[PDB]
Design a protein around this ligand. Structure first.
Ligand SMILES: Cc1cc2nc3c(=O)[nH]c(=O)nc-3n(C[C@H](O)[C@H](O)[C@H](O)COP(=O)(O)OP(=O)(O)OC[C@H]3O[C@@H](n4cnc5c(N)ncnc54)[C@H](O)[C@@H]3O)c2cc1C
Ligand SMILES: NC(=O)c1ccc[n+]([C@@H]2O[C@H](COP(=O)([O-])OP(=O)(O)OC[C@H]3O[C@@H](n4cnc5c(N)ncnc54)[C@H](OP(=O)(O)O)[C@@H]3O)[C@@H](O)[C@H]2O)c1
Length: 518
Protein backbone atom coordinates (compact mmCIF):
# COMPACT_ATOMS: atom_id res chain seq x y z
CA UNK A 1 0.00 0.00 0.00
CA UNK A 2 1.24 3.48 -0.93
CA UNK A 3 1.61 6.15 1.76
CA UNK A 4 -0.17 9.49 1.33
CA UNK A 5 2.28 12.41 1.31
CA UNK A 6 2.55 14.82 4.21
CA UNK A 7 1.72 17.95 2.19
CA UNK A 8 0.09 18.44 -1.21
CA UNK A 9 -1.44 21.26 -3.23
CA UNK A 10 -4.60 19.19 -3.76
CA UNK A 11 -5.86 15.98 -2.17
CA UNK A 12 -8.48 13.99 -4.08
CA UNK A 13 -10.77 11.41 -2.47
CA UNK A 14 -11.91 8.66 -4.82
CA UNK A 15 -10.26 6.74 -7.65
CA UNK A 16 -13.34 6.45 -9.86
CA UNK A 17 -13.86 8.32 -13.12
CA UNK A 18 -13.88 11.72 -11.40
CA UNK A 19 -10.87 11.43 -9.11
CA UNK A 20 -8.68 9.84 -11.78
CA UNK A 21 -9.27 12.71 -14.22
CA UNK A 22 -8.68 15.30 -11.49
CA UNK A 23 -5.39 13.56 -10.68
CA UNK A 24 -4.42 13.56 -14.36
CA UNK A 25 -5.31 17.21 -14.94
CA UNK A 26 -3.79 18.67 -11.77
CA UNK A 27 -0.58 16.85 -12.69
CA UNK A 28 -0.73 18.45 -16.14
CA UNK A 29 -1.33 21.85 -14.51
CA UNK A 30 1.90 21.54 -12.51
CA UNK A 31 0.31 20.94 -9.10
CA UNK A 32 1.18 18.36 -6.50
CA UNK A 33 -1.82 16.05 -6.13
CA UNK A 34 -2.60 12.71 -4.51
CA UNK A 35 -5.63 10.42 -4.24
CA UNK A 36 -7.02 8.39 -1.34
CA UNK A 37 -9.11 5.38 -2.42
CA UNK A 38 -10.69 2.75 -0.16
CA UNK A 39 -10.77 0.14 -2.94
CA UNK A 40 -7.67 -1.83 -3.89
CA UNK A 41 -7.62 -0.49 -7.45
CA UNK A 42 -9.15 2.16 -9.72
CA UNK A 43 -12.66 2.17 -11.15
CA UNK A 44 -15.06 3.50 -8.54
CA UNK A 45 -18.54 2.09 -9.09
CA UNK A 46 -17.18 -0.16 -11.85
CA UNK A 47 -14.65 -1.67 -9.41
CA UNK A 48 -17.31 -2.44 -6.77
CA UNK A 49 -20.43 -3.37 -8.79
CA UNK A 50 -19.03 -6.59 -10.24
CA UNK A 51 -22.34 -8.48 -10.17
CA UNK A 52 -23.30 -10.47 -13.29
CA UNK A 53 -25.07 -8.30 -15.85
CA UNK A 54 -23.77 -4.96 -14.53
CA UNK A 55 -23.98 -2.74 -17.61
CA UNK A 56 -23.89 0.94 -18.53
CA UNK A 57 -27.11 2.64 -19.61
CA UNK A 58 -25.34 5.29 -21.72
CA UNK A 59 -23.96 4.24 -25.09
CA UNK A 60 -20.26 3.33 -25.05
CA UNK A 61 -19.37 6.08 -27.54
CA UNK A 62 -20.77 8.73 -25.17
CA UNK A 63 -19.91 7.19 -21.78
CA UNK A 64 -16.15 7.64 -21.98
CA UNK A 65 -13.31 10.09 -21.45
CA UNK A 66 -12.62 12.71 -24.12
CA UNK A 67 -9.65 14.59 -22.64
CA UNK A 68 -7.10 12.22 -24.26
CA UNK A 69 -6.81 11.90 -28.03
CA UNK A 70 -4.70 8.74 -27.75
CA UNK A 71 -7.40 7.02 -25.67
CA UNK A 72 -10.20 7.97 -28.05
CA UNK A 73 -8.18 6.48 -30.92
CA UNK A 74 -6.64 3.37 -29.34
CA UNK A 75 -9.58 2.07 -27.31
CA UNK A 76 -12.19 -0.06 -29.11
CA UNK A 77 -15.63 -0.32 -27.55
CA UNK A 78 -17.35 -3.56 -28.53
CA UNK A 79 -21.06 -3.12 -27.73
CA UNK A 80 -23.71 -0.42 -27.72
CA UNK A 81 -23.71 -0.47 -23.90
CA UNK A 82 -20.47 -1.48 -22.21
CA UNK A 83 -20.56 -4.18 -19.56
CA UNK A 84 -18.99 -3.47 -16.18
CA UNK A 85 -15.94 -5.70 -16.90
CA UNK A 86 -15.21 -3.73 -20.09
CA UNK A 87 -15.59 -0.31 -18.43
CA UNK A 88 -13.14 -1.45 -15.75
CA UNK A 89 -10.61 -2.62 -18.35
CA UNK A 90 -11.06 0.77 -20.02
CA UNK A 91 -10.45 2.55 -16.72
CA UNK A 92 -7.38 0.44 -15.92
CA UNK A 93 -6.12 1.07 -19.45
CA UNK A 94 -6.30 4.82 -18.81
CA UNK A 95 -4.68 4.41 -15.39
CA UNK A 96 -1.87 2.49 -17.09
CA UNK A 97 -1.40 4.94 -19.97
CA UNK A 98 -0.90 7.90 -17.62
CA UNK A 99 0.78 6.16 -14.64
CA UNK A 100 -1.97 7.37 -12.32
CA UNK A 101 -1.62 4.71 -9.62
CA UNK A 102 1.74 6.16 -8.56
CA UNK A 103 -0.22 9.07 -7.08
CA UNK A 104 -2.95 7.00 -5.40
CA UNK A 105 -3.17 5.53 -1.90
CA UNK A 106 -5.33 2.41 -2.13
CA UNK A 107 -6.79 0.29 0.68
CA UNK A 108 -7.29 3.52 2.63
CA UNK A 109 -10.39 5.45 3.72
CA UNK A 110 -10.61 9.16 4.51
CA UNK A 111 -12.35 9.51 7.87
CA UNK A 112 -11.84 13.15 8.94
CA UNK A 113 -11.08 16.52 7.35
CA UNK A 114 -10.91 19.92 9.06
CA UNK A 115 -10.18 23.34 7.58
CA UNK A 116 -7.73 25.63 9.39
CA UNK A 117 -8.39 29.32 8.77
CA UNK A 118 -4.94 30.20 10.13
CA UNK A 119 -3.11 28.43 7.29
CA UNK A 120 -5.96 28.07 4.76
CA UNK A 121 -5.24 24.35 4.67
CA UNK A 122 -7.18 21.13 5.13
CA UNK A 123 -5.98 18.50 7.60
CA UNK A 124 -7.17 15.10 6.33
CA UNK A 125 -7.05 11.91 8.39
CA UNK A 126 -7.53 8.26 7.45
CA UNK A 127 -8.61 5.13 9.27
CA UNK A 128 -5.04 3.82 8.96
CA UNK A 129 -3.70 6.83 10.89
CA UNK A 130 -2.28 8.92 8.05
CA UNK A 131 -2.45 12.71 8.33
CA UNK A 132 -2.27 14.83 5.18
CA UNK A 133 -2.25 18.62 4.87
CA UNK A 134 -3.62 19.95 1.57
CA UNK A 135 -4.65 23.43 0.48
CA UNK A 136 -7.61 22.16 -1.58
CA UNK A 137 -9.78 19.09 -1.01
CA UNK A 138 -11.55 17.53 -4.01
CA UNK A 139 -14.41 15.20 -3.03
CA UNK A 140 -14.57 12.69 -5.90
CA UNK A 141 -16.24 10.30 -3.47
CA UNK A 142 -19.17 9.63 -5.78
CA UNK A 143 -22.94 9.76 -5.63
CA UNK A 144 -23.63 6.04 -5.20
CA UNK A 145 -20.42 4.91 -3.48
CA UNK A 146 -21.86 3.72 -0.15
CA UNK A 147 -23.65 0.35 -0.46
CA UNK A 148 -26.63 0.67 1.88
CA UNK A 149 -27.42 -2.45 3.89
CA UNK A 150 -31.23 -2.70 4.21
CA UNK A 151 -32.02 -2.57 7.92
CA UNK A 152 -33.70 -5.98 7.79
CA UNK A 153 -34.55 -7.66 11.10
CA UNK A 154 -32.58 -10.81 11.82
CA UNK A 155 -30.23 -10.21 8.88
CA UNK A 156 -27.31 -11.64 10.87
CA UNK A 157 -29.21 -14.91 11.40
CA UNK A 158 -29.09 -15.85 7.71
CA UNK A 159 -27.34 -19.20 7.42
CA UNK A 160 -26.70 -19.04 3.66
CA UNK A 161 -24.54 -16.82 1.48
CA UNK A 162 -25.25 -13.08 1.58
CA UNK A 163 -24.16 -10.84 -1.30
CA UNK A 164 -24.62 -7.16 -2.11
CA UNK A 165 -24.47 -6.04 -5.73
CA UNK A 166 -22.59 -2.89 -4.67
CA UNK A 167 -19.78 -4.92 -3.11
CA UNK A 168 -19.79 -8.10 -5.20
CA UNK A 169 -17.05 -10.75 -4.85
CA UNK A 170 -14.09 -10.35 -7.19
CA UNK A 171 -14.41 -14.04 -8.11
CA UNK A 172 -17.57 -15.06 -10.01
CA UNK A 173 -20.31 -16.65 -7.90
CA UNK A 174 -21.93 -19.87 -9.16
CA UNK A 175 -25.61 -20.08 -8.19
CA UNK A 176 -26.17 -23.40 -10.01
CA UNK A 177 -28.77 -25.53 -8.26
CA UNK A 178 -29.44 -22.94 -5.55
CA UNK A 179 -32.63 -21.31 -4.33
CA UNK A 180 -31.74 -17.64 -4.64
CA UNK A 181 -33.49 -14.51 -3.44
CA UNK A 182 -32.94 -11.05 -4.90
CA UNK A 183 -34.21 -8.13 -2.83
CA UNK A 184 -34.68 -4.94 -4.83
CA UNK A 185 -35.93 -4.25 -8.36
CA UNK A 186 -33.97 -1.17 -9.36
CA UNK A 187 -31.30 -1.04 -12.02
CA UNK A 188 -29.12 -3.46 -10.04
CA UNK A 189 -31.85 -6.03 -9.44
CA UNK A 190 -33.23 -5.86 -12.98
CA UNK A 191 -29.76 -6.46 -14.43
CA UNK A 192 -28.57 -9.21 -12.08
CA UNK A 193 -31.81 -11.22 -11.83
CA UNK A 194 -31.86 -12.48 -15.46
CA UNK A 195 -28.24 -13.62 -15.07
CA UNK A 196 -28.89 -15.49 -11.81
CA UNK A 197 -32.04 -17.14 -13.19
CA UNK A 198 -29.83 -18.95 -15.71
CA UNK A 199 -28.08 -20.86 -12.89
CA UNK A 200 -30.41 -21.06 -9.89
CA UNK A 201 -32.92 -23.85 -9.36
CA UNK A 202 -35.47 -21.37 -7.97
CA UNK A 203 -35.13 -17.58 -8.08
CA UNK A 204 -37.25 -15.33 -5.87
CA UNK A 205 -37.31 -11.66 -6.89
CA UNK A 206 -38.52 -9.53 -3.97
CA UNK A 207 -40.05 -6.28 -5.29
CA UNK A 208 -41.43 -3.43 -3.23
CA UNK A 209 -42.03 -0.44 -5.51
CA UNK A 210 -42.26 -1.47 -9.19
CA UNK A 211 -40.31 0.75 -11.58
CA UNK A 212 -40.27 1.46 -15.30
CA UNK A 213 -37.75 -0.36 -17.49
CA UNK A 214 -37.48 -0.40 -21.28
CA UNK A 215 -35.43 -2.79 -23.46
CA UNK A 216 -31.80 -1.82 -23.96
CA UNK A 217 -31.58 -3.63 -27.33
CA UNK A 218 -27.85 -4.07 -26.78
CA UNK A 219 -25.91 -4.89 -29.94
CA UNK A 220 -22.30 -5.27 -31.07
CA UNK A 221 -20.67 -2.03 -32.21
CA UNK A 222 -20.08 -1.97 -35.97
CA UNK A 223 -16.27 -1.69 -36.07
CA UNK A 224 -16.40 0.46 -39.22
CA UNK A 225 -18.89 2.77 -37.51
CA UNK A 226 -16.32 3.30 -34.76
CA UNK A 227 -13.67 3.87 -37.44
CA UNK A 228 -15.55 6.76 -39.04
CA UNK A 229 -16.51 8.20 -35.64
CA UNK A 230 -12.86 8.35 -34.54
CA UNK A 231 -11.89 10.61 -37.44
CA UNK A 232 -14.52 13.07 -36.12
CA UNK A 233 -14.56 12.22 -32.41
CA UNK A 234 -13.71 15.71 -31.13
CA UNK A 235 -16.53 17.32 -33.10
CA UNK A 236 -18.94 14.57 -32.00
CA UNK A 237 -18.08 15.20 -28.34
CA UNK A 238 -18.56 18.96 -28.59
CA UNK A 239 -21.94 18.15 -30.10
CA UNK A 240 -22.64 16.01 -27.03
CA UNK A 241 -21.50 18.88 -24.81
CA UNK A 242 -24.15 21.11 -26.43
CA UNK A 243 -27.11 18.94 -25.42
CA UNK A 244 -29.44 18.84 -22.41
CA UNK A 245 -28.49 15.25 -21.56
CA UNK A 246 -24.79 15.50 -22.38
CA UNK A 247 -25.45 12.80 -24.96
CA UNK A 248 -26.69 12.56 -28.52
CA UNK A 249 -30.47 12.12 -28.46
CA UNK A 250 -33.32 13.05 -30.79
CA UNK A 251 -35.54 15.74 -29.25
CA UNK A 252 -39.21 15.02 -29.86
CA UNK A 253 -40.86 18.22 -31.08
CA UNK A 254 -44.53 17.25 -30.79
CA UNK A 255 -46.69 17.30 -27.67
CA UNK A 256 -47.64 13.86 -26.35
CA UNK A 257 -51.31 14.90 -26.28
CA UNK A 258 -51.84 16.40 -29.76
CA UNK A 259 -51.05 13.06 -31.48
CA UNK A 260 -53.54 10.38 -32.49
CA UNK A 261 -53.69 6.92 -30.92
CA UNK A 262 -52.25 5.10 -33.93
CA UNK A 263 -49.47 7.68 -34.24
CA UNK A 264 -48.56 7.56 -30.54
CA UNK A 265 -48.47 3.76 -30.72
CA UNK A 266 -46.31 3.71 -33.86
CA UNK A 267 -43.88 6.35 -32.57
CA UNK A 268 -43.41 4.53 -29.27
CA UNK A 269 -43.10 1.09 -30.86
CA UNK A 270 -40.35 2.71 -32.94
CA UNK A 271 -38.41 3.63 -29.80
CA UNK A 272 -39.41 0.40 -28.05
CA UNK A 273 -37.87 -1.49 -30.97
CA UNK A 274 -34.80 0.75 -31.35
CA UNK A 275 -34.15 0.46 -27.61
CA UNK A 276 -32.45 2.69 -25.09
CA UNK A 277 -33.61 5.60 -22.93
CA UNK A 278 -34.15 7.96 -25.89
CA UNK A 279 -37.87 7.21 -25.51
CA UNK A 280 -37.72 9.79 -22.70
CA UNK A 281 -37.53 12.50 -25.38
CA UNK A 282 -40.04 10.93 -27.78
CA UNK A 283 -42.27 13.95 -27.08
CA UNK A 284 -41.31 17.35 -25.72
CA UNK A 285 -43.57 17.35 -22.64
CA UNK A 286 -43.23 13.79 -21.30
CA UNK A 287 -41.53 15.24 -18.20
CA UNK A 288 -43.43 18.55 -18.33
CA UNK A 289 -47.09 17.56 -17.82
CA UNK A 290 -48.79 14.65 -16.06
CA UNK A 291 -51.26 14.06 -18.89
CA UNK A 292 -48.59 13.69 -21.56
CA UNK A 293 -46.60 11.60 -19.07
CA UNK A 294 -49.44 9.19 -18.30
CA UNK A 295 -50.26 8.75 -21.98
CA UNK A 296 -46.73 7.54 -22.66
CA UNK A 297 -46.78 5.68 -19.33
CA UNK A 298 -49.83 3.60 -20.19
CA UNK A 299 -48.21 2.46 -23.45
CA UNK A 300 -45.25 1.06 -21.52
CA UNK A 301 -47.54 -0.51 -18.92
CA UNK A 302 -49.34 -2.32 -21.74
CA UNK A 303 -46.04 -3.51 -23.19
CA UNK A 304 -45.35 -5.11 -19.80
CA UNK A 305 -48.81 -6.68 -19.60
CA UNK A 306 -48.20 -8.10 -23.08
CA UNK A 307 -44.74 -9.54 -22.33
CA UNK A 308 -45.66 -11.39 -19.11
CA UNK A 309 -47.80 -14.42 -19.98
CA UNK A 310 -49.30 -14.49 -16.47
CA UNK A 311 -51.64 -11.48 -16.06
CA UNK A 312 -51.47 -11.92 -12.28
CA UNK A 313 -47.70 -11.48 -12.37
CA UNK A 314 -47.87 -8.78 -15.05
CA UNK A 315 -50.11 -6.33 -13.18
CA UNK A 316 -47.79 -6.20 -10.14
CA UNK A 317 -44.83 -5.64 -12.48
CA UNK A 318 -46.71 -2.61 -13.90
CA UNK A 319 -45.69 0.61 -12.12
CA UNK A 320 -48.53 2.96 -11.20
CA UNK A 321 -48.98 6.26 -9.41
CA UNK A 322 -45.62 7.98 -9.74
CA UNK A 323 -44.83 9.39 -13.19
CA UNK A 324 -42.66 7.85 -15.90
CA UNK A 325 -39.12 9.19 -16.17
CA UNK A 326 -39.03 10.93 -12.78
CA UNK A 327 -36.61 8.20 -11.65
CA UNK A 328 -33.63 7.30 -13.81
CA UNK A 329 -34.99 5.12 -16.59
CA UNK A 330 -33.83 1.51 -16.30
CA UNK A 331 -32.86 -0.55 -19.33
CA UNK A 332 -33.72 -4.24 -19.10
CA UNK A 333 -32.48 -7.23 -21.07
CA UNK A 334 -34.86 -10.19 -20.80
CA UNK A 335 -36.04 -9.02 -17.38
CA UNK A 336 -39.78 -9.02 -18.05
CA UNK A 337 -39.24 -12.16 -20.13
CA UNK A 338 -37.60 -13.65 -17.03
CA UNK A 339 -40.91 -13.97 -15.17
CA UNK A 340 -42.09 -16.36 -17.90
CA UNK A 341 -39.47 -18.89 -16.74
CA UNK A 342 -40.55 -21.76 -14.51
CA UNK A 343 -37.78 -21.12 -11.95
CA UNK A 344 -38.63 -17.43 -11.35
CA UNK A 345 -41.15 -16.05 -8.86
CA UNK A 346 -42.16 -12.43 -8.24
CA UNK A 347 -42.70 -11.68 -4.54
CA UNK A 348 -44.80 -8.52 -4.10
CA UNK A 349 -43.67 -7.11 -0.76
CA UNK A 350 -46.22 -4.29 -1.00
CA UNK A 351 -48.95 -6.86 -0.37
CA UNK A 352 -46.87 -9.04 1.99
CA UNK A 353 -44.07 -7.05 3.65
CA UNK A 354 -40.83 -8.64 4.77
CA UNK A 355 -41.10 -9.23 8.53
CA UNK A 356 -37.59 -10.61 9.16
CA UNK A 357 -34.65 -12.54 7.70
CA UNK A 358 -34.41 -16.02 9.17
CA UNK A 359 -31.65 -18.67 9.32
CA UNK A 360 -33.30 -20.40 6.35
CA UNK A 361 -34.29 -17.34 4.32
CA UNK A 362 -36.88 -14.56 4.21
CA UNK A 363 -40.16 -14.50 6.14
CA UNK A 364 -42.86 -12.19 4.84
CA UNK A 365 -46.37 -11.84 6.28
CA UNK A 366 -47.29 -14.65 3.83
CA UNK A 367 -44.68 -17.39 4.25
CA UNK A 368 -41.05 -18.22 4.90
CA UNK A 369 -38.81 -18.52 1.83
CA UNK A 370 -36.01 -21.07 2.04
CA UNK A 371 -32.98 -19.62 0.24
CA UNK A 372 -29.45 -20.92 -0.17
CA UNK A 373 -28.30 -17.42 -1.13
CA UNK A 374 -29.57 -13.89 -0.58
CA UNK A 375 -28.56 -11.07 -2.94
CA UNK A 376 -29.23 -7.52 -1.75
CA UNK A 377 -29.76 -5.17 -4.68
CA UNK A 378 -31.11 -2.46 -2.39
CA UNK A 379 -29.33 0.61 -3.74
CA UNK A 380 -27.03 3.00 -1.90
CA UNK A 381 -27.25 5.88 0.54
CA UNK A 382 -28.33 9.30 -0.68
CA UNK A 383 -25.95 11.45 -2.73
CA UNK A 384 -24.50 12.63 0.61
CA UNK A 385 -23.61 9.14 1.85
CA UNK A 386 -19.90 9.23 1.04
CA UNK A 387 -19.58 12.69 2.61
CA UNK A 388 -21.55 11.89 5.78
CA UNK A 389 -19.25 8.94 6.54
CA UNK A 390 -16.51 11.60 6.84
CA UNK A 391 -16.15 14.05 9.73
CA UNK A 392 -15.90 17.25 7.66
CA UNK A 393 -15.33 20.40 9.73
CA UNK A 394 -15.22 23.88 8.20
CA UNK A 395 -14.97 27.45 9.49
CA UNK A 396 -15.81 27.59 13.18
CA UNK A 397 -15.36 23.79 13.24
CA UNK A 398 -18.98 23.55 12.07
CA UNK A 399 -19.50 20.04 10.71
CA UNK A 400 -20.84 19.67 7.18
CA UNK A 401 -23.31 17.00 8.33
CA UNK A 402 -25.03 19.69 10.42
CA UNK A 403 -25.30 22.39 7.75
CA UNK A 404 -26.48 19.82 5.21
CA UNK A 405 -28.81 18.20 7.75
CA UNK A 406 -31.80 19.83 6.03
CA UNK A 407 -30.32 18.88 2.66
CA UNK A 408 -27.16 19.80 0.75
CA UNK A 409 -26.89 23.53 0.05
CA UNK A 410 -24.28 24.50 -2.52
CA UNK A 411 -23.30 27.13 -5.03
CA UNK A 412 -23.44 25.48 -8.48
CA UNK A 413 -23.26 22.09 -6.76
CA UNK A 414 -19.49 22.62 -6.52
CA UNK A 415 -18.91 24.35 -3.16
CA UNK A 416 -20.74 25.26 0.04
CA UNK A 417 -20.43 28.35 2.23
CA UNK A 418 -18.43 28.00 5.42
CA UNK A 419 -16.21 25.26 3.91
CA UNK A 420 -13.45 26.87 1.83
CA UNK A 421 -11.06 25.13 -0.54
CA UNK A 422 -13.49 22.20 -0.84
CA UNK A 423 -15.08 21.09 -4.11
CA UNK A 424 -17.54 18.33 -4.98
CA UNK A 425 -17.30 16.47 -8.30
CA UNK A 426 -20.59 15.27 -9.79
CA UNK A 427 -22.35 16.00 -6.53
CA UNK A 428 -25.69 17.53 -5.59
CA UNK A 429 -27.01 20.61 -7.38
CA UNK A 430 -25.44 19.74 -10.75
CA UNK A 431 -26.84 17.98 -13.84
CA UNK A 432 -26.71 14.19 -13.69
CA UNK A 433 -27.50 12.47 -16.98
CA UNK A 434 -24.40 11.36 -18.93
CA UNK A 435 -22.07 11.54 -15.95
CA UNK A 436 -18.88 11.26 -17.99
CA UNK A 437 -19.66 14.54 -19.76
CA UNK A 438 -20.71 16.14 -16.47
CA UNK A 439 -17.64 14.72 -14.70
CA UNK A 440 -15.17 16.05 -17.27
CA UNK A 441 -16.85 19.46 -17.17
CA UNK A 442 -16.69 19.49 -13.34
CA UNK A 443 -13.06 18.35 -13.09
CA UNK A 444 -11.95 20.92 -15.66
CA UNK A 445 -13.83 23.78 -13.98
CA UNK A 446 -12.47 22.91 -10.52
CA UNK A 447 -8.87 22.28 -11.56
CA UNK A 448 -8.99 25.41 -13.74
CA UNK A 449 -10.13 27.36 -10.69
CA UNK A 450 -7.34 25.82 -8.60
CA UNK A 451 -4.71 26.67 -11.23
CA UNK A 452 -6.24 30.16 -11.26
CA UNK A 453 -5.77 30.41 -7.49
CA UNK A 454 -2.09 29.46 -7.67
CA UNK A 455 -1.49 31.74 -10.67
CA UNK A 456 -2.79 34.78 -8.78
CA UNK A 457 -1.32 33.93 -5.38
CA UNK A 458 -4.70 33.43 -3.71
CA UNK A 459 -5.06 30.66 -1.15
CA UNK A 460 -8.70 30.61 0.07
CA UNK A 461 -11.77 30.13 -2.14
CA UNK A 462 -15.22 30.09 -0.54
CA UNK A 463 -18.71 30.23 -2.01
CA UNK A 464 -20.89 33.13 -0.88
CA UNK A 465 -23.83 32.31 1.40
CA UNK A 466 -26.23 34.52 -0.54
CA UNK A 467 -25.35 32.93 -3.89
CA UNK A 468 -25.70 29.52 -2.25
CA UNK A 469 -29.24 30.48 -1.22
CA UNK A 470 -29.86 31.98 -4.67
CA UNK A 471 -28.65 28.77 -6.33
CA UNK A 472 -30.71 26.54 -4.03
CA UNK A 473 -33.75 28.67 -4.90
CA UNK A 474 -33.08 28.72 -8.66
CA UNK A 475 -32.57 24.94 -8.75
CA UNK A 476 -35.89 24.60 -6.91
CA UNK A 477 -37.71 26.96 -9.28
CA UNK A 478 -36.57 25.34 -12.53
CA UNK A 479 -37.63 22.01 -11.02
CA UNK A 480 -41.27 23.08 -10.60
CA UNK A 481 -41.55 23.29 -14.40
CA UNK A 482 -41.11 19.49 -14.41
CA UNK A 483 -42.71 16.36 -12.99
CA UNK A 484 -39.58 15.52 -10.97
CA UNK A 485 -40.72 17.04 -7.63
CA UNK A 486 -43.51 14.40 -7.59
CA UNK A 487 -41.19 11.83 -6.00
CA UNK A 488 -34.05 21.48 -1.24
CA UNK A 489 -34.25 19.72 -4.61
CA UNK A 490 -30.98 17.90 -5.21
CA UNK A 491 -30.94 17.54 -9.01
CA UNK A 492 -30.41 20.37 -11.49
CA UNK A 493 -32.97 19.77 -14.25
CA UNK A 494 -31.90 22.67 -16.48
CA UNK A 495 -29.74 20.53 -18.72
CA UNK A 496 -25.99 20.11 -19.18
CA UNK A 497 -25.63 22.69 -21.95
CA UNK A 498 -27.26 25.46 -19.90
CA UNK A 499 -25.40 24.42 -16.74
CA UNK A 500 -22.00 24.53 -18.45
CA UNK A 501 -22.78 27.98 -19.84
CA UNK A 502 -23.65 29.15 -16.31
CA UNK A 503 -20.43 27.72 -14.87
CA UNK A 504 -18.24 29.17 -17.63
CA UNK A 505 -19.82 32.60 -17.13
CA UNK A 506 -19.16 32.47 -13.38
CA UNK A 507 -15.53 31.59 -14.11
CA UNK A 508 -15.26 34.22 -16.87
CA UNK A 509 -16.49 36.84 -14.37
CA UNK A 510 -13.65 36.33 -11.89
CA UNK A 511 -15.56 33.43 -10.29
CA UNK A 512 -18.61 35.47 -9.32
CA UNK A 513 -20.24 33.96 -6.26
CA UNK A 514 -16.87 33.03 -4.72
CA UNK A 515 -14.68 35.02 -2.35
CA UNK A 516 -10.95 34.65 -3.02
CA UNK A 517 -8.59 35.86 -0.29
CA UNK A 518 -5.07 35.36 1.02
C1 LIG B 1 -23.87 0.15 -10.61
C2 LIG B 1 -23.78 1.55 -11.16
C3 LIG B 1 -24.02 1.77 -12.51
C4 LIG B 1 -23.95 3.06 -13.06
N1 LIG B 1 -24.20 3.22 -14.41
C5 LIG B 1 -24.13 4.43 -14.91
C6 LIG B 1 -24.39 4.61 -16.32
O1 LIG B 1 -24.67 3.71 -17.11
N2 LIG B 1 -24.29 5.92 -16.76
C7 LIG B 1 -23.98 7.01 -15.97
O2 LIG B 1 -23.93 8.13 -16.51
N3 LIG B 1 -23.74 6.84 -14.64
C8 LIG B 1 -23.81 5.61 -14.14
N4 LIG B 1 -23.57 5.43 -12.79
C9 LIG B 1 -23.27 6.60 -11.97
C10 LIG B 1 -21.84 6.66 -11.50
O3 LIG B 1 -21.78 7.13 -10.15
C11 LIG B 1 -21.08 7.61 -12.42
O4 LIG B 1 -21.35 7.25 -13.78
C12 LIG B 1 -19.56 7.58 -12.23
O5 LIG B 1 -19.06 6.26 -12.41
C13 LIG B 1 -19.19 8.10 -10.86
O6 LIG B 1 -17.79 8.42 -10.85
P1 LIG B 1 -17.11 9.00 -9.57
O7 LIG B 1 -15.60 8.75 -9.69
O8 LIG B 1 -17.57 10.40 -9.40
O9 LIG B 1 -17.71 8.09 -8.42
P2 LIG B 1 -17.38 6.59 -8.02
O10 LIG B 1 -17.20 5.76 -9.25
O11 LIG B 1 -18.47 6.14 -7.05
O12 LIG B 1 -16.06 6.72 -7.23
C14 LIG B 1 -16.07 7.05 -5.83
C15 LIG B 1 -14.91 6.34 -5.18
O13 LIG B 1 -14.55 7.03 -3.96
C16 LIG B 1 -14.30 6.08 -2.96
N5 LIG B 1 -14.50 6.71 -1.66
C17 LIG B 1 -15.66 7.20 -1.14
N6 LIG B 1 -15.52 7.73 0.06
C18 LIG B 1 -14.18 7.57 0.33
C19 LIG B 1 -13.38 7.91 1.45
N7 LIG B 1 -13.86 8.52 2.54
N8 LIG B 1 -12.07 7.61 1.40
C20 LIG B 1 -11.58 7.01 0.32
N9 LIG B 1 -12.23 6.64 -0.79
C21 LIG B 1 -13.53 6.95 -0.72
C22 LIG B 1 -15.25 4.92 -3.26
O14 LIG B 1 -14.78 3.69 -2.72
C23 LIG B 1 -15.22 4.89 -4.79
O15 LIG B 1 -14.20 4.03 -5.29
C24 LIG B 1 -23.64 4.14 -12.22
C25 LIG B 1 -23.40 3.92 -10.87
C26 LIG B 1 -23.47 2.65 -10.33
C27 LIG B 1 -23.20 2.45 -8.85
N1 LIG C 1 -26.62 2.07 -15.80
C1 LIG C 1 -27.08 0.91 -15.07
O1 LIG C 1 -27.40 -0.08 -15.65
C2 LIG C 1 -27.16 0.96 -13.55
C3 LIG C 1 -26.99 -0.24 -12.74
C4 LIG C 1 -27.08 -0.11 -11.30
C5 LIG C 1 -27.33 1.13 -10.75
N2 LIG C 1 -27.49 2.24 -11.55
C6 LIG C 1 -27.76 3.50 -10.97
O2 LIG C 1 -27.36 3.52 -9.52
C7 LIG C 1 -28.61 3.93 -8.77
C8 LIG C 1 -29.02 2.84 -7.85
O3 LIG C 1 -29.31 1.66 -8.55
P1 LIG C 1 -29.83 0.37 -7.66
O4 LIG C 1 -30.58 -0.60 -8.45
O5 LIG C 1 -28.68 -0.45 -7.23
O6 LIG C 1 -30.69 0.88 -6.34
P2 LIG C 1 -32.15 1.65 -6.41
O7 LIG C 1 -32.36 2.23 -7.79
O8 LIG C 1 -32.19 2.73 -5.35
O9 LIG C 1 -33.36 0.60 -6.06
C9 LIG C 1 -33.21 -0.19 -4.91
C10 LIG C 1 -34.28 -1.22 -4.91
O10 LIG C 1 -34.16 -2.07 -3.69
C11 LIG C 1 -35.48 -1.89 -2.98
N3 LIG C 1 -35.28 -1.82 -1.59
C12 LIG C 1 -34.37 -1.04 -1.02
N4 LIG C 1 -34.44 -1.22 0.30
C13 LIG C 1 -35.49 -2.19 0.56
C14 LIG C 1 -36.05 -2.80 1.67
N5 LIG C 1 -35.56 -2.46 2.99
N6 LIG C 1 -37.02 -3.68 1.51
C15 LIG C 1 -37.48 -3.99 0.30
N7 LIG C 1 -36.98 -3.45 -0.81
C16 LIG C 1 -36.01 -2.56 -0.73
C17 LIG C 1 -36.08 -0.64 -3.51
O11 LIG C 1 -37.52 -0.72 -3.50
P3 LIG C 1 -38.35 0.70 -3.48
O12 LIG C 1 -38.25 1.37 -4.83
O13 LIG C 1 -39.79 0.44 -3.13
O14 LIG C 1 -37.73 1.60 -2.43
C18 LIG C 1 -35.61 -0.55 -4.88
O15 LIG C 1 -36.53 -1.27 -5.74
C19 LIG C 1 -29.68 4.20 -9.75
O16 LIG C 1 -29.96 5.64 -9.79
C20 LIG C 1 -29.23 3.75 -11.06
O17 LIG C 1 -29.50 4.78 -12.06
C21 LIG C 1 -27.41 2.17 -12.93
Amino acid sequence: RRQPPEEVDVLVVGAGFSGLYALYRLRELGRSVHVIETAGDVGGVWYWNRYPGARCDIESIEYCYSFSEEVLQEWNWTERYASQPEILRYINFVADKFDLRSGITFHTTVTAAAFDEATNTWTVDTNHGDRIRARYLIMASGQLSVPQLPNFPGLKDFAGNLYHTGNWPHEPVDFSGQRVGVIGTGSSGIQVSPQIAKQAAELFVFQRTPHFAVPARNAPLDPEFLADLKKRYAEFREESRNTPGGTHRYQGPKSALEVSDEELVETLERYWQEGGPDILAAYRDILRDRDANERVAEFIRNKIRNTVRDPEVAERLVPKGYPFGTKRLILEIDYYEMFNRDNVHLVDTLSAPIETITPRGVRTSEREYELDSLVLATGFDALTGALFKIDIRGVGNVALKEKWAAGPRTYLGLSTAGFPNLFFIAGPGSPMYNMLVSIEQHVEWVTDHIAYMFKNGLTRSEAVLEKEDEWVEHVNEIADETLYPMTVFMLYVGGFHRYRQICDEVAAKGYEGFVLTH
